[PDB]
Symmetry: C3
Subunit: 334 residues, 3 copies
């Protein structure tokens, strides 16, 4: 019925994003994506705490999918027989059938193919949502990512000027609920099913044990710091499928920010901290002015420093003494 | 002194809203409303947990009051002798005297009549606020609702175009604090006064036991699902008098959203999830494009699925395969 | 190198703000400020609970610094030898070096001088951030304040009209974490270092024991109520360095509100409640229309009434019966 050109995308693991055009002369296409569910025990902190994760494509978050307004997104969702539970997918970008969830419930050993038209621009969450109490559990176990639906003319500032990024990163924040035993040590479990009772009891108290970017404390640090150069315009897409977050670039700003994440609305300018509503993605762009280390955090600083929610940028370039200078180094008080 | 026409309104129980005009050729009127306080033990979940509720007009939330900018709202507040506590009313829409609270404190057996001019457009909370520690307790016991103050020309998109809804629903979200005994079972109490000590101790820890729409788990489901048809523009007014919420229509969008709830500001467009600040009401409109079941949730999914904060819409009409289609049903992996 | 005129500012304790111009014919200057760190045990509630505070200039919050866009802000930070810990300062308004923190780490007995150019307009947090787990601890111990960077033409409504305030107040909200002993009584400690272990364990659970304005329950009440007169336009700057807040003026409104706090964006109009993201400052202006007592709260009413987060305004002037009137005083029900 639908006779449009087909284009396959090779998804890449976060925080990177598959290659795409911003402004495009292409017309609508059917863009084809594949997600393969993986349930797996992973390590989430530098002390070796383990977690029963459930993921799209083996990562937390799931990969960022990028399309343009009016494209048709055709996803093959695969639930291999090596998994234990049914799963599905719900796209906040899509219209009808609970975002697709009512059409994609698959048991281990099955796959399904869903197509939806990208009628709404912005960044959007996608997540598993099998039904009932399983919905929060699968999401907070890691089964969420995001999609970005660009205008065909690319981004603008609302005020007819184009806003072109040099690079884009996707920072998926995950609230995790790991129960503790009587000693006060984090518990380990042999299966997601076995983790369920204790994990649900903790979840209902609403306080996470960990809040992490890219699946683990320190994931986006050291060798895996985010990078930029002075003069580069970087777009940071930030999602949180269950709980609020308040992103902040320490030493920088959000030059243009869509905190509700939707490109039909003009961005706000010159923010210090912005707010990602639980169940949403937002986006912020910043042109780096200074070299050095920056930290990208949620600005609940307890969560950032003590629960895991800190990434770093390492930025190359020349220091600008007009913008900031140490007039007098630390010295004894006169 | 004030010589304007008087109009009586028959309030209706949420989620329905009393009949009103959007755009009107009427001039200012004195619009007359009556609220009768009822303290009552109610059931809040499908397991039979009870709660000592305090309500305006017998409902949680209290009913939605609808007027137009420049009307005078004249409320008779009635506290029958069958109640145990003093009560009052504070309207966020009103100016002076703590929103009216300083002029409406009434003991059991008394009534009072307050008039305020509707100078600010939008949706606003109203709530009881007797003084001191009683303020949070009365609010989280159920004593809150909302008022909607429409422009006389009706709603607009900010961009000179009219925005007319086919129907309006009021979803009042309530955070409830029910203490547990040593066993781990929810406690029942013989009076609001007897529930006070244990309830205050829990309240100060800031974690609700239940988060519900329209007073109970499952209230807006089954026979009491919200309804629409494909092609209908529905306005959903959402209030939360004490705690933040993040509304989301699963399978839909907020086509036009006033998340801070005030019609002097243009709506945002094409949202996935929006944010209702504790102590406020907001409003979102959506034109349904697909038939079927939708869930309307706060997108803290633990609260939605496990604590009570889910409503359903049942929508009639024709499925649109252009917008979404199951290209291949669940099948064994090749 | 930088040859501009120098101007010294005498900082004043919150909620007051040092004298400044709104619109100015001055060009860029180097504006000189001094902050002296003080670690001190203070009383935070009317029951006599004590707290190991860490402050800029002896106050919580630290004082508001006011400059204009394109000024250079030169701060001398002083850490006297009477303190026990290293400290630094990070300005969200500044660009590079973690907001200045990477250039201002000072041991007891040292001082440092930092200059930054005020390229971004709005209200911004400043806070200490020494590194690692110390970052949240120093902030929630009191080491935060705000700076306001005004346009040189003063404030505007976005719609070419000027917005001039008659007075400005700075309300700094502090979430505090005071542990309890087995009895259930709040603990007292002999030093910040001794309070650290118990305080960090509580902090990671994310629930404060107290939420206060200006450092203490009841600080901005009685003799220290905020004041205004009918007809006065008051700007209220509100900051929260770690945790969200939802300000509300009971009996009033936010006539013009920058809830993300940045003057490059037009204000929203006619709000009931606004939202300050943890790690940010915002600002709201209101022209008083009625005399009497107003309460300024966070509209989590449990926090406001039970945890400490209430200020009062006492307003002088003539009551306006058109806006609100008690039509019939409390009487027996007919
Ligand atoms: O940035 C979106 C914002 O900008 C405005 C102009 O104020 O419209 C621009 O963006 C639209 C969506 O990309 C374009 O269709 C339009 O042509 C362009 O002017 C606003 O209408 C919009 O909210
Ligand atoms: O939607 C409100 C938003 O729209 C604007 C136009 O951009 O003004 C419209 O709405 C006002 C309030 O209803 C009307 O008085 C006005 O005539 C109309 O253009 C904005 O000014 C406003 O913020
Ligand atoms: O209030 C800021 C908001 O107003 C606009 C006009 O809609 O610009 C005004 O404010 C700018 C910043 O102060 C001035 O430079 C400009 O000249 C003035 O019109 C918007 O552009 C801005 O977002
Ligand atoms: O599953 N580990 O690559
Ligand atoms: O009070 N029950 O209808
Ligand atoms: O330290 N007291 O003024
Ligand atoms: Cu799943
Ligand atoms: Cu969802
Ligand atoms: Cu009451
Ligand atoms: Cu209120
Ligand atoms: Cu410090
Ligand atoms: Cu900071």
């Amino acid at each position: 019925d639908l006779k449009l050109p087909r284009q396959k995308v090779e998804l890449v693991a976060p925080p990177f994003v598959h290659a795409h055009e911003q402004a495009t002369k292409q017309g609508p296409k059917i863009v084809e994506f594949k997600l393969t569910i993986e349930e797996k025990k992973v390590v989430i902190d530098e002390k070796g705490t383990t977690f029963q994760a459930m993921t799209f494509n083996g990562s937390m978050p799931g990969p960022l999918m990028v399309v343009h307004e009016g494209d048709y997104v055709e996803t093959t969702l695969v639930n291999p027989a090596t998994n234990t539970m049914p799963h599905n997918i719900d796209f906040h970008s899509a219209t009808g059938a609970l975002g697709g969830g009512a059409l994609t419930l698959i048991n281990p050993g099955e796959q399904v193919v869903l197509r939806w038209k990208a009628t709404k621009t912005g960044v959007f969450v996608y997540h598993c949502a099998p039904g009932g109490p399983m919905i929060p559990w699968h999401v907070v176990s890691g089964m969420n990512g995001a999609v970005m639906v660009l205008p065909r003319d690319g981004l603008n500032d609302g005020k007819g000027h184009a806003l072109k990024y040099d690079k884009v990163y996707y920072v998926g924040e995950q609230d995790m609920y790991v129960p503790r035993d009587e000693k006060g040590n984090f518990k380990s479990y042999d299966s997601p099913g076995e983790a369920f009772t204790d994990t649900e009891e903790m979840m209902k108290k609403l306080i996470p044990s960990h809040v992490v970017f890219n699946g683990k404390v320190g994931a986006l640090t050291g060798k895996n710091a985010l990078t930029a150069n002075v003069g580069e315009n970087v777009l940071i897409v930030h999602s949180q499928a269950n709980r609020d977050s308040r992103p902040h670039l320490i030493g920088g700003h959000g030059d243009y920010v869509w905190e509700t994440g939707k490109f039909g609305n003009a961005p706000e300018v010159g923010l210090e901290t912005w707010f990602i509503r639980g169940g949403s993605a937002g986006a912020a762009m910043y042109k780096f002015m200074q070299p050095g280390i920056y930290a990208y955090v949620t600005h609940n600083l307890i969560e950032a420093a003590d629960l895991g929610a800190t990434a770093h940028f390492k930025v190359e370039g020349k220091w600008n003494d007009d913008l900031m200078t140490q007039v007098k180094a630390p010295a004894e008080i006169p």
